[PDB]
Each structure stands twice: as structure tokens, then as C-alpha cells.
Amino acid sequence: INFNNKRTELANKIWDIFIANGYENTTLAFIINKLGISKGALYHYFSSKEECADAAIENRVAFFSNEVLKESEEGLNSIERLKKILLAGIINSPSNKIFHQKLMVAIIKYFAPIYADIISQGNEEGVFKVKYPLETAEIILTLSHFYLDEDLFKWKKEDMSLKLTAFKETLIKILDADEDTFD
Amino acid sequence: INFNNKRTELANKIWDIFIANGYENTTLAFIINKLGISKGALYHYFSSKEECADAAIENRVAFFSNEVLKESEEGLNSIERLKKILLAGIINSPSNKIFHQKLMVAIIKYFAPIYADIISQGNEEGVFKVKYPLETAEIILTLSHFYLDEDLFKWKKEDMSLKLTAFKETLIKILDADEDTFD
Ligand code: NA
Numbered sequence: 001i002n003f004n005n006k007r008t009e010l011a012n013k014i015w016d017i018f019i020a021n022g023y024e025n026t027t028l029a030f031i032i033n034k035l036g037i038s039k040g041a042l043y044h045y046f047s048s049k050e051e052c053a054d055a056a057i058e059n060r061v062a063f064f065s066n067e068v069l070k071e072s073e074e075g076l077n078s079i080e081r082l083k084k085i086l087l088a089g090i091i092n093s094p095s096n097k098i099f100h101q102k103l104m105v106a107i108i109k110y111f112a113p114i115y116a117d118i119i120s121q122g123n124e125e126g127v128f129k130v131k132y133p134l135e136t137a138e139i140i141l142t143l144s145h146f147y148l149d150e151d152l153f154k155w156k157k158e159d160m161s162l163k164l165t166a167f168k169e170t171l172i173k174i175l176d177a178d179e180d181t182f183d
Numbered sequence: 184i185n186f187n188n189k190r191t192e193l194a195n196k197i198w199d200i201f202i203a204n205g206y207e208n209t210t211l212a213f214i215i216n217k218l219g220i221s222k223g224a225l226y227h228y229f230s231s232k233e234e235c236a237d238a239a240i241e242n243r244v245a246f247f248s249n250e251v252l253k254e255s256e257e258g259l260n261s262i263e264r265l266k267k268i269l270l271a272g273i274i275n276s277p278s279n280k281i282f283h284q285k286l287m288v289a290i291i292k293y294f295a296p297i298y299a300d301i302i303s304q305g306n307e308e309g310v311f312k313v314k315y316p317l318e319t320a321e322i323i324l325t326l327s328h329f330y331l332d333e334d335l336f337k338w339k340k341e342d343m344s345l346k347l348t349a350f351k352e353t354l355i356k357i358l359d360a361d362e363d364t365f366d
């Protein structure tokens with residue numbers, strides 16, 4: 001109620017600490033020293049380092065997604081809204097890969113309804129023909145955040161151009177959109 | 184050369200230890216005690232617990248994928264090969280989620296050429312019309328191993344039926360296959 005305002009202020013600061021310093025190497029002692037708080041002050045809001053990460057991620061993605069909705073120009077068609085939202089954006093140790101995975105999952109879950117809305121708008125305009133708008137939104141986001149992640153798959157830098165092309169091709173098929181939609 | 188035969192025999196045994204006991208809670212001391220080997224015997228083949236996991240995963244997936252190729256019936260059409268291969272199959276703490284992620288990534292990388300071959304066969308038969316066979320194979324596997332993973336996304340059990348339906352719909356669009364292909 002009031003506890004929520006304080007917890008998210010800290011989560012925001014923890015985000016900056018995890019990004020700037022890495023998740024694996026950030027200790028609860030480093031966090032509290034950097035924040036200027038005690039162990040007790042931290043344990044009042046979080047039970048673990050994982051919860052600190054989840055709170056940092058939730059608040060960052062909740063913010064980023066809300067700033068996409070407020071920045072959305074009134075009356076834009078679905079094709080332009082899709083193009084605009086696709087261009088949006090905020091060591092590879094096992095724990096650092098978990099922080100990245102958590103972030104991909106949160107982005108997918110927060111952006112899926114926005115993309116679902118765009119897809120539904122396009123079905124109504126007659127530019128797409130998608131049977132399952134929310135599932136298709138989640139499908140697209142999974143491809144953009146897992147398949148196009150070169151660090152996840154250790155994809156070669158010279159192969160990324162073909163993956164983006166293949167991604168656009170897939171988007172066209174899935175949406176039943178015109179072939180020149182993403183040109 | 185000869186070192187490889189021994190290393191993969193251990194990797195196979197480590198796999199069983201990680202599955203039966205969980206990755207997070209499996210200590211290097213538990214591994215060596217269960218295997219009947221010394222710390223030195225283990226450090227001769229692996230530098231870390233992560234490398235033990237990667238070796239266990241590589242050898243399991245390399246095996247599983249090779250047993251799919253040997254079990255493949257001679258002269259099956261692409262539609263039946265696809266249906267057959269789709270039915271194939273071997274705590275949620277941060278480290279356990281890494282073991283699972285590593286496994287998903289290895290399955291995708293080992294099975295992609297098999298699915299690419301099936302897709303190419305179908306393009307030749309005239310049952311599919313896919314511009315990028317290997318990228319499309321990787322796209323499909325990403326959806327079956329990330330999007331359909333209810334533990335990754337914490338999807339509701341009652342929503343899984345719609346996700347499978349949406350997955351099949353997507354497969355049909357991506358492959359340019361007939362609508363009754365997966366019935
Ligand atoms: Na859903």
C-alpha cells in the first residue's frame with residue numbers, strides 16, 4: 001500500500017546495481033553498501049538475492065511497458081504500431097544467464113497483451129488474419145527474445161542477418177500479412 | 184581419441200546423478216562418492232560442475248538424436264516423419280532452471296538439422312513451401328521448447344490445450360501445409 005512504493009524504489013536501485021556490476025558477482029553485502037542500507041533494511045522487503053532480481057526485473061519491465069503505452073500515438077494503424085514496438089528495447093555464467101532468462105520471460109509476459117491488442121487491431125483493419133491473437137503475440141515475442149538471442153544459442157555474428165530475415169518471413173506467415181509489410 | 188570414450192562414460196553417469204538428484208543440490212563430493220572416483224579422477228576430465236553438466240547434456244542429446252536417425256523408417260514421407268519426431272522426448276531454483284535451459288538449447292541445436300531435412304523433403308514432395316529450412320526448423324524447436332514450457336512461463340495447466348492448438352496453427356502457417364496435416 002505504502003510498503004509497495006518503498007520496495008519498488010529499492011528494486012529500481014538494485015536493477016542498476018545488477019546491470020552495472022553483473023548478477024553472479026553482486027553479493028547482498030555489495031548491494032546494501034551501495035544502497036547505504038543495513039542487512040535488516042533489505043530483509044524487510046526481500047527474502048533472497050533471487051527475489052531482489054525478480055523485483056528489479058518486474059519494476060523495470062512494468063515501467064518500460066507502461067512508457068510504451070503512454071508514448072503510443074493516437075490513431076496509428078496496426079502495421080505502424082507493430083513496426084514501432086518491434087524496435088523498442090530497455091559474462092555468460094549460469095547465474096547471469098538466469099537473470100537474462102528472467103528478464104526475457106518478464107518482457108514476454110508484459111508485452112504480449114500490447115502485441116495482442118495490435119494483432120486484434122490489424123484483424124479488424126483487415127491487414128492480418130490471426131485466429132489466436134494473445135498466443136500469437138507470445139509466439140512472436142518468444143522468437144524475438146529466445147531465437148534471435150545470439151548469446152543464448154552462441155549464434156555466429158555473420159548468421160544474424162539471415163535469422164532476422166527468417167524472423168520477418170515467419171512474422172509475415174503467422175500474421176497473414178502482405179509480403180512488403182516489414183520493408 | 185581414447186580419453187573421449189572414458190569422458191562420455193562418466194558424462195552419462197553424471198547425467199543420471201543430476202536428473203535423479205537435481206543440479207543445484209548435487210555437489211562435486213556427492214558426484215565422486217556416487218561414481219566411486221576421486222576428486223583428481225573427476226578433475227582429469229572436467230574443470231567445473233558446469234562442464235560436468237554440459238558434458239552430461241551433450242552426450243545425452245547426441246545419443247537421443249542419433250537414436251532418432253537410426254529408428255527412422257526408410258521411405259517415410261515428410262508429414263509422417265514430422266509427426267513422429269514431434270512426439271519424441273528423452274525444484275525451479277535459478278541453477279536448476281540453467282540446467283533445463285542448457286538442455287533446451289542442446290536439443291534445439293542437435294534436432295534442427297533433422298527437422299531441416301524433413302522440411303526440405305516436404306518442399307521437394309510439394310507438401311510444404313518453406314524459404315529457409317534450417318532457420319524454420321530452429322524456429323519450430325524454439326516454440327516447442329520455450330513457448331510450450333509451462334514451468335518456464337508458469338503457464339496455467341488449463342491454458343496448455345490452447346497453446347498446443349496455437350502451436351499447431353503456427354506450424355501450419357510457417358510450413359504452408361494443408362490445414363488437416365496434424366489431425
Ligand atoms: Na496465455
Ligand code: NA
Nearest residue numbers: 159317318321
Ligand atoms: Na543456423
